[PDB]
């Protein structure tokens, strides 16, 4: 009965660890979209046809998007627990009916 | 970083205080009474350039959302109250559970 | 040349009308009084992005 | 030098008109540059909306 109850708690524990990995990945989904857009802007700016005025105009959206990445990193959270800014570090998720059975999730 | 980025950075780097910016571009910091006792002391170069003045006790009753600054500070204040209510709901939940165990024991 | 100048002053006043009258529900935008406004986009306070209209 | 703007454009003379081509060009760069700021702000807010929905 102690193992059965600990297995119920372990299933909840694994599900919560799935939730944090899911939310963090969803945030990284927009980090990929923002980065790819910055790559298209960088390629367009490198073209020799552009003059200084247009390169500055492209730089405006580069800086707006770059600030967008930092906002995603600093604001993404799971109930106030910031994930993507590096303060999450390594947290161990207990998946098991007995103590000592946990898996280390690292968010960077 | 612009001032609104300093505010979001401080938010992600700690949970003891909550930073914001009002209509005049002044950085507000709110230390809830559920997390911090006494007075908060500010130092460093950034605080030297952002003289933080003295602290004023704010509660839910004194919330005034008629300004950008008042609204931001009221989000933090309402969060302190929400933690306060949840905490007491957990003390009453533990009390009820312990009294259900007591009833079962007395029946035996 | 004078006739053109009357076209220039007709359009020049049109620009000042666009600046003074353009508004979003009565809140003027292009006349310079908008200045900088912070838009709160986030589940917690302090997460805002400043939009500056000139 | 004398401070000139679109408001001060006076095309009643050849000299005034030539000064007005340069003045209008600078104004057109001012309008375009602000429109690029507002385009970047809109796109950034669309990326933010996608992130918040996720």
Curated annotation (Swiss-Prot), chain A:
Subcellular location(s) per record: Secreted; Bacterial flagellum
Coiled-coil boundaries: 49-75
Family: Belongs to the bacterial flagellin family.
Function comment: Flagellin is the subunit protein which polymerizes to form the filaments of bacterial flagella. FlaD is not essential for flagellar synthesis and motility.
Other remarks on this protein: V.cholerae is able to differentially regulate the flagellins within the flagellum maybe to produce flagella which are particularly suited for motility within a given environment.
Assembly and interaction partners: Heteromer of multiple flagellin subunits including FlaA, FlaB, FlaC, FlaD and FlaE.
Protein name listed in UniProt: Flagellin D
Shown residues within the full chain: 55 to 162 of 377
From Swiss-Prot, chain C:
Subcellular location: Secreted; Bacterial flagellum
Coiled coil: 1-21
Superkingdom of this protein's organism: Bacteria
Bilayer-crossing regions: none
Job description of the protein: Flagellin is the subunit protein which polymerizes to form the filaments of bacterial flagella. FlaD is not essential for flagellar synthesis and motility.
Subunit description: Heteromer of multiple flagellin subunits including FlaA, FlaB, FlaC, FlaD and FlaE.
Family stated for the protein in its record: Belongs to the bacterial flagellin family.
Other notes: V.cholerae is able to differentially regulate the flagellins within the flagellum maybe to produce flagella which are particularly suited for motility within a given environment.
Name this protein carries in UniProt: Flagellin D
Species of the source: Vibrio cholerae serotype O1 (strain ATCC 39315 / El Tor Inaba N16961)
Interval of the full protein contained in this chain: 109 to 162 of 377
């Amino acid at each position: 009965n102690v193992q059965s109850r600990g297995l119920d708690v372990a299933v909840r524990n694994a599900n919560d660890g799935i939730s944090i990995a899911q939310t963090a990945e969803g945030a990284m989904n927009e980090t990929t979209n923002i980065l790819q857009r910055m790559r298209d802007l960088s390629l367009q700016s490198a073209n020799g046809s552009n003059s200084k005025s247009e390169r500055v105009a492209i730089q405006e959206e580069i800086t707006a998007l770059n600030d967008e990445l930092n906002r995603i990193a600093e604001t993404t959270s799971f109930g106030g627990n910031k994930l993507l800014n590096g303060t999450f570090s390594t947290k161990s998720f207990q998946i098991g009916a007995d103590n000592g059975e946990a898996v280390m999730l690292t968010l960077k | 970083d612009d001032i609104e980025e300093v505010a979001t950075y401080i938010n992600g780097q700690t949970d003891m205080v909550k930073a914001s910016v009002n209509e005049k571009g002044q950085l507000q910091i709110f230390a809830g009474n559920n997390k911090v006792t006494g007075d908060v002391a500010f130092s460093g170069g950034l605080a030297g350039a952002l003289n933080m003045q003295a602290g004023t006790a704010e509660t839910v009753d004194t919330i005034d959302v008629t300004s950008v600054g008042g609204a931001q500070q009221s989000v933090a204040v309402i969060d302190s109250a929400l933690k306060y209510v949840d905490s007491h709901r957990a003390e009453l939940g533990a009390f009820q559970n312990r009294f259900n165990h007591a009833i079962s024991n007395l029946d035996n």
